[model samples]
Target: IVKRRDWEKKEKKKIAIERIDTLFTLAERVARYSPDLAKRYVELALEIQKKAKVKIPRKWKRRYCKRCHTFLIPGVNARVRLRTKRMPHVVITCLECGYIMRYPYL
Candidate 1:
């Protein structure tokens, strides 16, 4: 987890996304046995997903080093990410460059 405000937000977003995936899985299982409770989890998971869609904005701070063409540490950098919210894989793009970086999200 990142401690700096610059780093923390992105990491938190990633964690939240992962949590949603986990909860959704749990909700699916729960729905099989306890439809009522599963409904609750599904509702909560959907709410979180909706929030994630709206509230999670990309941070534009910290930039790449122009000289090295590498992402500056603690700055908005490249990360291999998994797609969420009906998104597909191969969504890894440099926060700075529109360059795609190979990353695994599963």
Candidate 2:
């Protein structure tokens, strides 16, 4: 199961890289003819990517199983906090087990 999960992660990473590469190539082409639009699209892509990144405070720690202790792992048996329009709610989920622990909805 662990090996399968790692493979899935690697595949996802490859797909993400492909997506970014495609976007960058398109942006580069547009840059030649439409510098402003190209820059705008590239900027938008960057913004989207930035927001996609989970906001994990440096001090935040997780209590993982004894066997697996990985901090950088995506939601590695942990939760994430995504800022919303009205209020920010932290979502706690394990990337491995997919155990969701949503904070009290305010």
Candidate 3:
């Protein structure tokens, strides 16, 4: 019974991962024509993860805005800038919601 449940959980995680990939692909394609459609895809992906109790990969989690939940495309809906002040950092600004995120320089 435990093994069966573990397999099922793994299956669900695979499905969720597939959906997440589709989400990013659709977002980029749809963003060119309709921002709303792109947003919808992002929301759908999040819902899939929530329903399946799967966590999005760290690489993908950083691809969107935390505040507005918008898929970010640098030089498009998002701007990327390098800030060198007291500490070197990378600044990401979301144009849609005007949200800014900073990370230590790589």
Candidate 4:
């Protein structure tokens, strides 16, 4: 019984992770044409993340705005700038909601 339950748990986690990946892919593909559709995909991804307790992959981590939850594209929906004075980091500003995010480069 214990072995079977463990196998089931692993299978569930695997499917959840795969669904999260699919959501991010769909968001990226739809972001260029319709921002709204892309936003929906992001929404679903977050929902799945919460329910599954899974972390999103790093490549798509910086692709969505935290404030407005909109998909970001450099020079289109968001601005990218590097700050090297005090701390070496990249500053991202979302044009939709004017949300600023700073990520350190290490």
Q: Best candidate, TM-score-wise?
A: 4
Clashes of each: 0, 2, 0, 0
lDDT of 1 at 26: 62
* Poorest lDDT segment (10 consecutive residues) of candidate 3: 55-64
* Deviating ranges (above 4 Å) for candidate 1: 1-3, 54-106
Cα TM-score per model: 0.42, 0.39, 0.82, 0.87
Instruction: Report the lDDT of model 3 for residue 24.
Output: 72
Worst ten in a row by lDDT for model 2: 63-72
Candidate 3 lDDT tens digits, 41-80: 8888888988988887666766778787788888888989
Better of 1 and 4 by lDDT: 4
- Rank candidates by lDDT, best first: 4, 3, 1, 2
Enumerate residue pairs that collide in model 3: none
- Residues 54-104, candidate 1: write the lDDT tens digits: 332222111222222333222235455566666455344555556554323
Please list the C-alpha lDDT of all candidates, in the order they appear. Answer: 0.48, 0.47, 0.84, 0.89
Please give the range of 10 consecutive residues that has the lowest summed lDDT in model 1: 56-65
Backbone collision tally, model 1: 0
List per-candidate RMSD values in Å. Answer: 16.9, 16.8, 2.1, 1.6
- How do the residues 1-106 of candidate 4 rate in per-residue lDDT, one tens digit apiece? 9999999988887787788889889988989998899999999988988887887787888889988889899988899999899989989999989999998876
Model 2's alpha-carbon lDDT is: 0.47
